[PDB]
Amino acid sequence: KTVTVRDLVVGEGAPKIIVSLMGKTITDVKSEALAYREADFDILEWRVDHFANVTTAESVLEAAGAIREIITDKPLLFTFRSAKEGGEQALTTGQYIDLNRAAVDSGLVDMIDLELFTGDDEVKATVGYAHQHNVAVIMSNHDFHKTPAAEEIVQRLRKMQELGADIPKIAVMPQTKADVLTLLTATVEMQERYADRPIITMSMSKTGVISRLAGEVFGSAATFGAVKKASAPGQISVADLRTVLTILHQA
Amino acid sequence: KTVTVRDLVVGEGAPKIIVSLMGKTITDVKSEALAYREADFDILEWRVDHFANVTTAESVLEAAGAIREIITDKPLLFTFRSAKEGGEQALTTGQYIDLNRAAVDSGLVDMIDLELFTGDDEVKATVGYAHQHNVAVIMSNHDFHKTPAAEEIVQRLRKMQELGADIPKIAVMPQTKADVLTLLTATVEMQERYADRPIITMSMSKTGVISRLAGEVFGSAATFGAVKKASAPGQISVADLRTVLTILHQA
Ligand SMILES: O=C(O)C1=C[C@@H](O)[C@@H](O)[C@H](O)C1
Ligand SMILES: O=C(O)C1=C[C@@H](O)[C@@H](O)[C@H](O)C1
Ligand SMILES: [Zn+2]
Ligand SMILES: [Zn+2]
Ligand SMILES: [Zn+2]
């Protein structure tokens, strides 16, 4: 029901805060890490798609090591967000899978992100590989154009569980206020019908910001905040995020 | 359309904060007003149903005057909540109308609360009477045990507009998380399709707390908070409420 990554217990208490580190070079990654020591979050997501030398394994490994040397007490989530799903760069399926396998091999990351629509066989294999190294998997899906029907959102989260995700995650784009409620409904329905582990959901953009602030009642276990710049539309500053989460938790 | 009550413009910007004052005697009322004086809220609601011998109009008017002497810069809302709607006591329809008209006549109150289910003839005439004296009307309905279907919530809010309410208000109790989303759905449908004035909606208890915070995005113009140290589930202190409402407004 819960997922423990280094003493952090996800799926219990107030929603956990994830922030994304985005750096093009190892120098930028180190500088950003140093700046992120001055923020209050629970999980550090390294957005590897922002890293220019992603196709050079040694460079990626060096950067992950550098982050770990600076940010020593926060779980590290390795995420290459594909351009197909709103990220900064496209890779072939093989390159993407091999990149995540290399992250797992490094022993420097606590979690990897795998995109649900990468391919079932590849996802299953990579989940197994991660698990044999005690690395957790956040499985992800995005719709940057619309909000699918609640039932479709629920079935995608359910499939993520079937594929072995430790934490299913979905982000959708509202076109109307009603779409924000559709995302919250899907979160509630997934919780009561299928979830046997934590899930993360969000409705993007300013229109959907309430979904990033109210996950405790509806069933989203974590939420993203912005340190200096948002890594997806709709994130608010991390200190304000903790403030709201705490107020709601004690309400 | 907005509703202006002494400089306060309801229906524009972040939702407004209403606090409720309860006292049995003029001494209780003075003590509470002194305690509330420095708190950060927008409208002071006096819950007259908690006051003793309300059928003695003169004692009620003396208490209203006492409040106005202490709280000089906040709009004052006069609310007799009937027992049938979760209040402390009952009055005949005639006594209730006379009490509210006496409040209008005093010049001490900026708004009165009229319950939708009081009866159409009496309500509409008293709305006219209040308007004749430049007193705004919040028309209210409450269900402390359950949440009506979204369609019924919308119907009630539409009827309040039809009867001439300046601000339709509904508060309902969720039994499930889905009930909270039902209340938000009704708020969105009402505000986007039928509303031509500010509306106030709320889902009670801790489960419904989102409804006190998301007024700007779903269409509720005000929320209720606590001044008092000790509060109830779902009720947020006014300082914390202002903090969250501002964070959402500035997101
Ligand atoms: O909606 C969000 O806040 C995000 C979703 C994921 O794609 C993350 O990888 C991204 O960095 C932030
Ligand atoms: O739940 C609350 O905090 C309240 C809501 C409104 O009905 C107010 O009229 C009532 O006095 C208190
Ligand atoms: Zn190995
Ligand atoms: Zn007159
Ligand atoms: Zn009942």
From Swiss-Prot, chains A, B:
GO terms for biological process: 3,4-dihydroxybenzoate biosynthetic process; amino acid biosynthetic process; aromatic amino acid family biosynthetic process; chorismate biosynthetic process. One of its GO terms (molecular function) is 3-dehydroquinate dehydratase activity. CDD domains: DHQase_I. It comes from the Bacteria. It catalyses: 3-dehydroquinate = 3-dehydroshikimate + H2O. Changing E85A: Very strong reduction of the catalytic efficiency and almost the same affinity for 3-dehydroquinate. 3-dehydroquinate binds at S20, E45, W46, R47, R81, R212, S231, Q235. Keywords: Amino-acid biosynthesis, Aromatic amino acid biosynthesis, Lyase, Schiff base. Belongs to the type-I 3-dehydroquinase family. Involved in the third step of the chorismate pathway, which leads to the biosynthesis of aromatic amino acids. Catalyzes the cis-dehydration of 3-dehydroquinate (DHQ) and introduces the first double bond of the aromatic ring to yield 3-dehydroshikimate. The reaction involves the formation of an imine intermediate between the keto group of 3-dehydroquinate and the epsilon-amino group of a Lys-169 at the active site. This is 3-dehydroquinate dehydratase. It comes from Salmonella typhimurium (strain LT2 / SGSC1412 / ATCC 700720).
